[PDB]
Ligand binder design. Structure first.
Ligand SMILES: Nc1ncc(-c2cnc3ccccc3c2)cc1-c1n[nH]c(=S)o1
Length: 299
């Protein structure tokens, strides 16, 4: 590939596994190339993100160390997309694989991938309302209704991913971004598709605070790992502060689990039953995303 052209998922995945010019594969017709190119200020305009609860704007949102998300607008279709910049050295096929193959209303759609210089630009669905972490940080504890609303979206994302035998591996407030009508799941960098009933990891993956005990133990886990992470995300959404942090992490988590003490006194018995169910230590006794959607607290 020497130019930016429209292609299939198979073309995108082949490019991902594979001189000042730009090359790449566009999956959605929303991204407009002109003469096998996609240049800034000529084809796409990089607009700032709106920090709703801060009355200011931001050119980009920092995502770890080897990631920054910009807000791009296709000058032709006027379509707003998020633009994630991942350097070639730190670029993994997992960053495109799940989003290219599996499309769902509650998974941020990958529109295209463009390599320019030493960085890979991933154009995808822009959560213009921001991340669940941004709301919590700028406002504090969320209201029970907003919690129920967001969770019903995430659970519909996870039920789909787990039906495809996929473990996200990083469900946290930071990876739940939202729009006016819905919330989408982001960051598939640590994602993995299960080949068997149990997944055996080679290294510890995820964010310590939201990690399940079975993940920290490294003996074996499944899609149930995401359910615990959602429970940990829920206690952060409910209290406004992440679990463990207030009381006190790998040693503390492997011994004490779940952090049921971190659940606020204000919490409703319905939501508390949902949070406690999702945080169940035994993965076998922990509910599926499909099961939790049927819970009284959500419906
Ligand atoms: N598609 C996206 N849409 C939105 C965001 C985002 C995150 N935080 C914000 C905070 C404050 C304001 C806006 C925000 C927007 C991140 C992405 C994204 N995709 N892949 C990864 S990793 O990040």
């Amino acid at each position: 590939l020497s130019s930016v052209r429209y292609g299939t998922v198979e073309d995108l995945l082949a490019f991902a596994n594979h001189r000042p010019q730009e090359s790449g594969i566009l999956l959605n017709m929303v991204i407009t190339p002109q003469n096998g190119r996609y240049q800034i200020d000529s084809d796409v305009l990089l607009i700032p993100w709106k920090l709703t609860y801060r009355n200011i704007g931001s050119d980009f949102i920092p995502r770890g160390a080897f990631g920054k998300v910009y807000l791009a607008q296709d000058i032709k279709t006027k379509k707003r997309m998020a633009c994630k910049l991942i350097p070639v050295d730190q670029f993994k096929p997992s960053d495109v694989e799940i989003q290219a193959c599996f499309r769902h209303e509650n998974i941020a759609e990958l529109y295209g991938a463009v390599l320019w210089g030493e960085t890979v630009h991933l154009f995808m669905e822009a959560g213009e309302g921001g991340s669940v972490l941004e709301k919590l940080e700028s406002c504090g504890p969320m209201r029970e209704f907003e919690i129920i609303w967001v969770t019903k979206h995430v659970l519909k994302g996870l039920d789909f991913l787990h039906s495809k035998k996929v473990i996200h591996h990083d469900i946290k407030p930071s990876n739940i971004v939202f729009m006016s009508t819905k919330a989408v799941l982001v960051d598939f960098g640590l994602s993995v598709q299960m080949t068997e009933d149990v997944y055996f990891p080679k290294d510890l993956r995820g964010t310590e605070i939201y990690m399940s005990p079975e993940v920290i133990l490294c003996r074996g886990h499944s899609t149930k790992a995401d359910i615990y992470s959602l429970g940990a995300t829920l206690i952060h959404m409910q209290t406004g502060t992440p679990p463990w942090v207030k009381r006190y992490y790998l040693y503390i988590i492997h011994k004490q689990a779940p952090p049921l003490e971190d659940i606020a006194d204000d919490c409703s018995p319905g939501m508390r039953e949902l949070i406690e169910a999702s945080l169940e230590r035994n993965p076998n006794h922990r509910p599926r995303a499909a099961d939790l959607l049927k819970h009284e607290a959500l419906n």
